[PDB]
Design a protein around this ligand. Structure first.
Ligand SMILES: [K+]
Ligand SMILES: [K+]
Ligand SMILES: [K+]
Ligand SMILES: [Mg+2]
Ligand SMILES: [Mg+2]
Ligand SMILES: [Mg+2]
Ligand SMILES: [Mg+2]
Ligand SMILES: [Mg+2]
Ligand SMILES: [Mg+2]
Ligand SMILES: [Mg+2]
Ligand SMILES: [Mg+2]
Ligand SMILES: [Mg+2]
Ligand SMILES: [Mg+2]
Ligand SMILES: [Mg+2]
Ligand SMILES: [Mg+2]
Ligand SMILES: [Mg+2]
Ligand SMILES: [Mg+2]
Ligand SMILES: [Mg+2]
Ligand SMILES: [Mg+2]
Ligand SMILES: [Mg+2]
Ligand SMILES: [Mg+2]
Ligand SMILES: [Mg+2]
Ligand SMILES: [Mg+2]
Ligand SMILES: [Mg+2]
Ligand SMILES: [Mg+2]
Ligand SMILES: [Mg+2]
Ligand SMILES: [Mg+2]
Ligand SMILES: [Mg+2]
Ligand SMILES: [Mg+2]
Ligand SMILES: [Mg+2]
Ligand SMILES: [Mg+2]
Ligand SMILES: [Mg+2]
Ligand SMILES: [Mg+2]
Ligand SMILES: [Mg+2]
Ligand SMILES: [Mg+2]
Ligand SMILES: [Mg+2]
Ligand SMILES: [Mg+2]
Ligand SMILES: [Mg+2]
Ligand SMILES: [Mg+2]
Ligand SMILES: [Mg+2]
Ligand SMILES: [Mg+2]
Ligand SMILES: [Mg+2]
Ligand SMILES: [Mg+2]
Ligand SMILES: [Mg+2]
Ligand SMILES: [Mg+2]
Ligand SMILES: [Mg+2]
Ligand SMILES: [Mg+2]
Ligand SMILES: [Mg+2]
Ligand SMILES: [Mg+2]
Ligand SMILES: [Mg+2]
Ligand SMILES: [Mg+2]
Ligand SMILES: [Mg+2]
Ligand SMILES: [Mg+2]
Ligand SMILES: [Mg+2]
Ligand SMILES: [Mg+2]
Ligand SMILES: [Mg+2]
Ligand SMILES: [Mg+2]
Ligand SMILES: [Mg+2]
Lengths: 95, 120, 124, 50, 68, 81
RNA sequence: AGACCUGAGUGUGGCAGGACUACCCGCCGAACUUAAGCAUAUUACUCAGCGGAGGAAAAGAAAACAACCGUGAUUCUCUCAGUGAGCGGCGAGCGAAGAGGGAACGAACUCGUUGCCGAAUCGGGUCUUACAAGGCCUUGAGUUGUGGCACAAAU
RNA sequence: CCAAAGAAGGUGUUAGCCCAUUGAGCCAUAAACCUGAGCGCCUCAUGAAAAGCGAGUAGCACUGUUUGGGAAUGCAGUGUCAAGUUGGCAGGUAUUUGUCUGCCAAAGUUAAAUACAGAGUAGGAAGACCGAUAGCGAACAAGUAGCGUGAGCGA
RNA sequence: GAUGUGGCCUGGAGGUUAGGACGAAGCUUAUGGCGUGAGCCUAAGAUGGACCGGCCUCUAGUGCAGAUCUUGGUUGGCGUA
RNA sequence: CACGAGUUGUUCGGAAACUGAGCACAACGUUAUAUCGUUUUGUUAGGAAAGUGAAGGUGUGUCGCCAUAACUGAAAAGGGGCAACAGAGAACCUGGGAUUAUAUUCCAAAAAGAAAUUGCAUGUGGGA
RNA sequence: AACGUGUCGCGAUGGAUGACUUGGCUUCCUAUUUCGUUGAAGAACGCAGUAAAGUGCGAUAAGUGGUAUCAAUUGCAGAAAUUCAAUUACCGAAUCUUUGAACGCAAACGGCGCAUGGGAGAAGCUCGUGUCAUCCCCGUGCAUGCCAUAUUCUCAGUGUCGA
């Protein structure tokens, strides 16, 4: 192998998901739609976002909706399974 | 060796000097007692040094160095200050070559510097 | 917080990876705090944690590269050395003749050199 | 309109991000020379044409 | 140039050197020397040596001696 | 007529951004750049425009690796013992 | 069957590609301009164009000068010399080379050929601390010729 | 009061003695470089004590080009094309004979003196130069803002 | 159109003499004096805030009123169309 | 002007994945110079550009033949690509009290709901 | 008268002049001074607690490591002396996103492959494990040409022979 750098498997999830959003739309989605909102990697897809959510916050994402914002950042609308409460995991996150 | 034949180059080397060259440039003379006991004529000023202003308006003012700004080419002294329009107290900057070091803040590295400097 | 470089150098690869994981977790939490306001004292910890991550990764990569350069030192492996582990120098310097190849002489040239060596002499 | 390639969208996003005033504390720095951004762009004055 | 036999043979060792890259493009081969007039010396090639450009520079550059 | 009225007849665009130089000189229909001749391997360089050459030459950008290799050459490829 | 020759396909190990291009090397190559017009001429074997390398390049070791009491690779400098050379609608204009004073210079070598040998060669493995200018092994290349000895500074 | 230091920068006015500087010298050091071709060990090398030499080549012819080269300086295309048993090339007016001088083409490598006429890296020295409409377009977040579909233009 | 001028003026260089924080250059003038003149000098700034004058010589990117001159600013037309 | 926000898709448009007027990488040829020419009239290149695999043999598993791995091949002429957001193709469509701004894109268990379609698998039921 | 005309003093507009120059231009010198498929030069995105440009840097992102220094940086904030954490200078160790000669195939697509290693896997299977189909992610190799080469690889030819 011509690549000799040490790349670990325990960090990819931290790169896939950057930070949650605190805006009013995000708060409404948390309260009503059981949905969390994160800024994610712009090269990431929905499958790896689901895996990152599972590995980071120990919740199941039934649906992930993504958009690339007009400022270049990709947003993620992540609805959790009914067995997980978005408000509880949001408090656990610190949002 | 900032000074050279070309004044343009000497001024450029002085005013674009890095931080450590600026430290060397901002040296102050030691007192006669310190010159007697260390056989050194001048040292770069340092925080917590005790200095006395020899030149300028604040001549005779004595205090402890609180800051060596090195970006404004000045040292801030606790006893040297003035009030603003608000009445709050602000530190007046003094060029280190206008002051005199009366007590040194001594550390092992500065002791090694003094041993490097002494003429004996 | 801050990780000492000597402490990182004494640690093992698995412990290094674990420390990297915990620091990445801390940096993620600090990014969250940076989004939701947060105390300036907390936000002052971001740069130390990023530099500690950089220090851990530097130790990991230096150890890996030294170990791999050791592994390919043997002539049985040295022909299969990855390009990234070989010496860089310059493209022309890599393709240029080495001193050993440059100094090659014919048997006639060597015999001439031995038979008529250059002398050291002086004139009064 | 609706269609743009993602590279063009990212160039437009960067130009949108650069279109900011200078922070106030920049003007208070030692030896500062910057007052305005002077590279501010308005969509109705000069065209990026991406 | 990368063959070990070439690189370790004194007779052909010179051509590995970087100054001989594409020597046919600069006219250094025998045919290039032929069409450059380097087959002749002395009075048959005075204006051709070392090259036409070199002799033209010698004969056409205006010389300003310091004191004149 | 020609003039103002015909300015409103100008639709589309002859050039878009170039992948190689990013100059908005890539002729869409000919699929080649007017500024750097991409996708030709070599770039446009003409001695009748020395100003353009100086605009595009080495050092006008970043020299990410050139500075590193220059420093390594200046230090005679110093390596640890 | 197999061999050789002439060509393929894969594996293995490498190289080329672009940039720079002020100077340097090869080709290509104008016109404005001057001639008080203009066509040869001039500008100019220049600009523009194409290709190539370096720290310098190119040149360089006599199929050279000369006609001497002879000199002695190349390059460059002053002079030769704007020349009682020479080329030119012999008009406008172009236009060098020996020699001499110097800079530099340990400056000289390598093939082919011809004679005498004839694999003594070169790559690969492997071992000597070693991809040794070494030893062993290898049809693998090579006898459609690698290498060694001698050729005027020699005997 | 210094001066083996007067050196021209900084500091609130014009500073040898306020600061930095301005010396001898000291410390450290991957390789490379220099030194009885520095000095050891193993290995490996090593010194002396008759023939013929470059063939589509060189020449000629024609045509083009280049040159001061002029009955043709060099080169190119095509034609056709050698000699070496008294050889070949050069000897600046063509030819045929002789006689003399040099030299031995058609394979190759070579440092230094030379260029850097809009290059680049790391450092230096400066100037009877310009002093913000000057000097680089640019003393400033300048090849920037801005203009053009574009080549480009450009404060 | 030629020439002459111990003829005037400007930026630098060798010299030589001075001047300046008790105010240098720049700038202003019903501000006088001198010179045929180019100009020079003084005075006053309720101007300026740090450089600079005279003389001998050397040197040049050395003197503007106009080039449908260049750049910058202003301006009557005009509170008009 | 300043600050803070906003663009959510298995089914919508594109691509994945069609050919067209055409382009021109390779290949070959030419040119002092590739930065030139040829390259759809079924179609590159003096041109050996197929790396696929019908039937066989051998072996595994599935049954009473099928699938899977290997050795010998029948057949298949004419290299690789791009070029349509109006041609071809294309499995979602209503209600909402779901916004300040998005929606055939959001709605969560009574999904307001009702579907249609791929890919892979497990049982069920039948055959090998 | 009023408009208007002068002169003086003081204001405004306007930024000449003079001083000052970390700039330019010109000349000269030194040297283990000359990039790139081991991916250059150029393009593009991004990185700071605060950060538009510029500078520096590359997901280790206004920097990691090492060596010298010897207490800062500085607008605010945060942290707080013998190597071990400062800050500067230098450099040996590293990092180095998408590209670009750009080279798996394309491209106004952050697209799509073939081999080969991995990773994650909430269905299923197996006893919350382990294993894991489709789907997804990552690393490496894969352009063309040429040279050498195959412990002597596989072939083709009404080429030349030989059995
Ligand atoms: K001195
Ligand atoms: K002082
Ligand atoms: K001919
Ligand atoms: Mg979407
Ligand atoms: Mg001193
Ligand atoms: Mg529209
Ligand atoms: Mg408009
Ligand atoms: Mg658009
Ligand atoms: Mg000569
Ligand atoms: Mg129209
Ligand atoms: Mg068009
Ligand atoms: Mg080119
Ligand atoms: Mg090239
Ligand atoms: Mg002219
Ligand atoms: Mg004429
Ligand atoms: Mg005329
Ligand atoms: Mg005429
Ligand atoms: Mg000519
Ligand atoms: Mg030219
Ligand atoms: Mg070069
Ligand atoms: Mg040479
Ligand atoms: Mg000679
Ligand atoms: Mg003469
Ligand atoms: Mg004469
Ligand atoms: Mg001529
Ligand atoms: Mg001589
Ligand atoms: Mg031989
Ligand atoms: Mg001074
Ligand atoms: Mg010796
Ligand atoms: Mg001969
Ligand atoms: Mg011939
Ligand atoms: Mg001519
Ligand atoms: Mg040569
Ligand atoms: Mg140079
Ligand atoms: Mg200017
Ligand atoms: Mg200008
Ligand atoms: Mg008159
Ligand atoms: Mg002047
Ligand atoms: Mg008056
Ligand atoms: Mg003038
Ligand atoms: Mg005037
Ligand atoms: Mg008016
Ligand atoms: Mg606005
Ligand atoms: Mg905004
Ligand atoms: Mg073509
Ligand atoms: Mg056709
Ligand atoms: Mg078609
Ligand atoms: Mg055909
Ligand atoms: Mg298509
Ligand atoms: Mg359609
Ligand atoms: Mg659709
Ligand atoms: Mg709307
Ligand atoms: Mg739904
Ligand atoms: Mg920024
Ligand atoms: Mg990384
Ligand atoms: Mg590609
Ligand atoms: Mg390509
Ligand atoms: Mg046969």
């Amino acid at each position: 192998s011509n690549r000799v750098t040490v790349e670990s498997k325990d960090i990819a999830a931290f790169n896939v998901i950057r930070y949650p959003l605190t805006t009013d739309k995000a708060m409404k989605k948390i309260e009503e739609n059981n949905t969390l909102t994160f800024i994610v990697d712009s090269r990431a897809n929905k499958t790896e976002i689901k895996k990152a959510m599972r590995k980071l916050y120990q919740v199941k994402a039934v649906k992930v909706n993504t958009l690339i914002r007009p400022d270049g950042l990709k947003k993620a609308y992540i609805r959790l399974s009914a067995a997980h409460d978005a408000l509880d995991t949001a408090n656990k996150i610190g949002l | 060796s900032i000074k050279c034949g070309s004044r343009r180059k000497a001024r450029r080397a002085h005013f674009q000097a890095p931080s450590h060259v600026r430290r060397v440039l901002m040296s102050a003379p030691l007192s006669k007692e310190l010159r007697a006991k260390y056989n050194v004529r001048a040292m770069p000023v340092r925080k917590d040094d005790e200095v006395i202003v020899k030149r300028g308006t604040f001549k005779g003012r004595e205090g402890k160095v609180t800051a060596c700004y090195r970006l404004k080419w000045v040292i801030l002294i606790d006893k040297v200050n003035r009030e603003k329009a608000n009445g709050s107290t602000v530190a007046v900057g003094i060029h280190p070559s206008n002051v005199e070091i009366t007590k040194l803040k001594l550390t092992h590295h500065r002791k090694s510097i003094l041993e490097r400097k002494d003429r004996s | 917080h801050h990780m000492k470089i000597k402490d990182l150098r004494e640690k093992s690869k698995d412990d290094l990876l674990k420390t990297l994981t915990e620091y990445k977790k801390e940096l993620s939490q600090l990014r969250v705090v940076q989004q939701t306001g947060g105390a300036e004292t907390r936000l002052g910890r971001i740069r130390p944690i990023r530099k500690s991550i950089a220090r851990i990764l530097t130790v990991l990569n230096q150890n890996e590269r030294s170990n791999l350069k050791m592994f390919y030192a043997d002539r049985k492996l040295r022909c299969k050395t990855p390009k990234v582990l070989r010496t860089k120098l310059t493209h022309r310097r890599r393709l240029a003749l080495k001193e050993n190849e440059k100094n090659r002489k014919t048997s006639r040239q060597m015999r001439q050199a031995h038979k008529f060596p250059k002398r050291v002499y002086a004139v009064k | 309109g609706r269609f743009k390639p993602l590279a063009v969208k990212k160039k437009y996003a960067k130009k949108m991000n650069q279109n900011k005033p200078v922070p106030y504390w920049i003007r208070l720095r030692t030896g500062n020379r910057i007052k305005w951004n002077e590279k501010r762009r308005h969509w109705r004055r000069t065209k990026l044409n991406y | 140039p990368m063959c070990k036999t070439i690189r370790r043979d004194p007779r052909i060792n010179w051509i590995v050197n970087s100054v001989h890259k594409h020597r046919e493009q600069r006219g250094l081969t025998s045919a290039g020397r032929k069409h450059r007039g380097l087959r002749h010396k002395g009075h048959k090639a005075s204006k051709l040596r070392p090259s036409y450009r070199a002799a033209w520079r010698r004969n056409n550059r205006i010389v300003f001696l310091r004191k004149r | 007529t020609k003039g103002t009225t015909s300015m409103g007849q100008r639709h589309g665009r002859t050039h878009i951004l170039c992948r190689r130089c990013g100059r908005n000189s890539y002729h869409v229909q000919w699929e080649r750049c007017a500024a750097c001749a991409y996708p030709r391997a070599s770039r446009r360089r003409y001695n009748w425009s020395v100003k353009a050459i100086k605009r595009r030459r080495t050092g006008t950008g970043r020299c990410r690796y050139l500075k590193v290799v220059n420093r390594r050459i200046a230090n005679h490829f110093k390596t640890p013992k």
